[PDB]
Amino acid sequence: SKMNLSEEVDLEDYVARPDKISGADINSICQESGMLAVRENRYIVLAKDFEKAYKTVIKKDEQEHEFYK
Amino acid sequence: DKSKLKPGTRVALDMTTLTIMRYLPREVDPLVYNMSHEDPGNVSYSEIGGLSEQIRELREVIELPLTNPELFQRVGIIPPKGCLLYGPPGTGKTLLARAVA
Amino acid sequence: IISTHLAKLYDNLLEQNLIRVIEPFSRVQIEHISSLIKLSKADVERKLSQMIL
Amino acid sequence: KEQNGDVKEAASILQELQVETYGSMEKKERVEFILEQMRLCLAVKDYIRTQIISKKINTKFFQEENTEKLKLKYYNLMIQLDQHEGSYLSICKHYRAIYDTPCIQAESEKWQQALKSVVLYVILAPFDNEQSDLVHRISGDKKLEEIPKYKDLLKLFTTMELMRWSTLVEDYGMELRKGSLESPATDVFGSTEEGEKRWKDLKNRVVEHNIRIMAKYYTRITMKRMAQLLDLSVDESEAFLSNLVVNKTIFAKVDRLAGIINFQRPKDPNNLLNDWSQKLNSLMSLVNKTTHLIAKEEMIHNLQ
Ligand SMILES: Nc1ncnc2c1ncn2[C@@H]1O[C@H](COP(=O)(O)OP(=O)(O)OP(=O)(O)O)[C@@H](O)[C@H]1O
Numbered sequence: 258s259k260m261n262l263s264e265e266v267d268l269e270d271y272v273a274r275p276d277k278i279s280g281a282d283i284n285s286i287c288q289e290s291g292m293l294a295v296r297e298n299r300y301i302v303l304a305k306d307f308e309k310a311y312k313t314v315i316k317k318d319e320q321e322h323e324f325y326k
Numbered sequence: 327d328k329s330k331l332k333p334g335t336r337v338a339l340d341m342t343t344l345t346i347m348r349y350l351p352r353e354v355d356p357l358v359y360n361m362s363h364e365d366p367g368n369v370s371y372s373e374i375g376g377l378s379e380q381i382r383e384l385r386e387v388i389e390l391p392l393t394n395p396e397l398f399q400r401v402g403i404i405p406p407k408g409c410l411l412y413g414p415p416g417t418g419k420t421l422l423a424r425a426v427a
Numbered sequence: 428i429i430s431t432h433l434a435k436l437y438d439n440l441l442e443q444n445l446i447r448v449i450e451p452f453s454r455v456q457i458e459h460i461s462s463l464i465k466l467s468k469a470d471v472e473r474k475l476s477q478m479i480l
Numbered sequence: 481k482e483q484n485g486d487v488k489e490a491a492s493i494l495q496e497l498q499v500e501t502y503g504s505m506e507k508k509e510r511v512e513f514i515l516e517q518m519r520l521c522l523a524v525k526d527y528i529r530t531q532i533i534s535k536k537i538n539t540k541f542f543q544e545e546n547t548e549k550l551k552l553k554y555y556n557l558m559i560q561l562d563q564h565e566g567s568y569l570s571i572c573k574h575y576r577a578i579y580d581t582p583c584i585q586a587e588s589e590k591w592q593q594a595l596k597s598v599v600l601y602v603i604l605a606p607f608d609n610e611q612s613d614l615v616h617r618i619s620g621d622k623k624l625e626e627i628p629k630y631k632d633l634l635k636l637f638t639t640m641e642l643m644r645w646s647t648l649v650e651d652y653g654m655e656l657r658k659g660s661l662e663s664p665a666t667d668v669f670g671s672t673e674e675g676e677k678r679w680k681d682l683k684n685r686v687v688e689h690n691i692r693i694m695a696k697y698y699t700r701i702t703m704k705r706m707a708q709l710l711d712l713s714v715d716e717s718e719a720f721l722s723n724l725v726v727n728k729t730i731f732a733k734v735d736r737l738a739g740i741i742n743f744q745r746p747k748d749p750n751n752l753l754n755d756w757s758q759k760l761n762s763l764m765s766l767v768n769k770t771t772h773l774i775a776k777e778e779m780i781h782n783l784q
């Protein structure tokens with residue numbers, strides 16, 4: 258609401274995802290997406306900083322190995 | 327300037343009159359005095375290599391709030407806190423902080 | 428129910444414009460203020476009397 | 481070299497400034513490559529891009545010791561970037577910094593153009609406190625009086641020095657028309673709509689100087705006299721004062737029923753009586769003590 262977004266590309270795909278996300282991580286992704294606009298000398302979300310920030314923060318530990326359902 | 331006498335500052339009293347002569351900022355508890363006065367390496371990012379993708383990314387998160395806050399006011403973001411260096415021993419991890427200090 | 432907030436935004440927009448014509452002067456005629464707001468003179472008086480009360 | 485294709489080369493270099501940051505930031509070649517794309521983005525009216533890639537350059541300071549053609553083309557783009565917006569003091573700070581850099585080779589003529597750029601518009605900047613010391617530092621030098629614009633500067637200091645814009649437009653027009661050298665004069669004024677606004681803003685700054693001298697050297701004035709002394713109508717004079725008083729920068733109050741703009745305030749009876757006794761005390765006790773003691777001191781010199 259304060260950060261300038263003003264885009265057609267909405268964050269609806271990154272809502273119903275698995276791997277439950279704490280409330281502090283929403284702040285970290287939107288900061289990391291903000292760094293990925295400023296570092297490359299932009300001002301606006303170009304529909305790729307949000308996805309690269311998500312793929313950076315989630316890589317900790319993963320699959321249930323299709324075992325015990 | 328008694329407005330500068332905040333309830334919890336440090337002053338210097340007279341030995342006999344006991345009134346306030348001069349106020350003092352704060353103690354600096356000499357255990358951490360040695361944790362400031364040291365020279366890193368007088369290095370200039372030239373004793374480091376093969377890490378420039380990670381060097382610049384660390385220089386991005388630190389050097390901008392202490393130099394350039396206008397790039398963080400134009401975008402509705404709070405300036406970030408610190409980072410972390412993790413990995414096997416031998417690749418930087420001390421010289422990299424020696425570079426930025 | 429939206430026209431109530433439209434009336435409150437209307438009555439805000441009167442008293443925001445009617446305070447920008449106070450700092451230049453103490454004593455003034457009213458027909459200049461009617462001409463500067465370019466709206467009327469009768470609602471301006473009922474608004475200014477409401478702001479004093 | 482093929483064409484002036486200003487869209488193809490502009491976006492294709494901004495997508496690679498993020499790339500060769502990995503070679504270390506060398507003091508000359510990296511700096512020269514990163515100032516190349518900003519003059520391109522100034523040319524395609526991309527001003528949001530230029531001011532940020534130029535905002536990075538301030539981490540490299542005191543680099544003018546080995547080279548001289550670096551700081552010139554940097555500031556020559558910085559004066560144009562702030563030219564499109566207001567805030568004229570930043571162009572003056574850049575004009576003063578391009579005044580001492582070529583002069584190290586003792587410029588016969590280029591030193592005169594950088595001198596003319598500084599001294600032309602300092603009044604065009606807003607007056608808060610930074611115009612005050614700036615006109616005290618750039619004036620009073622050994623080499624500035626070679627141009628009558630220093631007398632134009634000295635006239636617009638303060639105390640009105642008999643100023644009037646109709647008199648100002650008629651005597652210094654030859655400086656604004658073709659002169660002997662006249663090389664920065666055409667560069668600033670006498671131009672397209674960029675220059676015509678600078679006529680209006682120069683008109684705007686002198687009448688803002690003319691309101692400040694009235695509110696200090698007067699108490700009350702009729703509105704017909706203020707209108708004719710500012711060479712403009714009664715409607716513009718009211719709207720220009722209404723701009724100043726909502727800006728809380730000139731402190732006055734008008735009358736549209738009898739036409740008396742006054743300049744003082746209704747003073748307080750606690751304030752007025754305290755200022756009565758203060759002018760009673762320090763003007764009738766200290767010098768009263770001094771009259772008695774100088775007359776005692778004259779007893780020694782006179783007799784015997
Ligand atoms: N990536 C590198 N580039 C250049 N020199 C390096 C690099 N990594 C280590 N060195 C060399 O190693 C020395 C510094 O050791 P370093 O700080 O890397 O140890 P360390 O990784 O902090 O050890 P530990 O992780 O056990 O604390 C320097 O003399 C430097 O020449």
Ligand SMILES: [Mg+2]
Pocket residue numbers: 419420
């Ligand atoms: Mg170590």
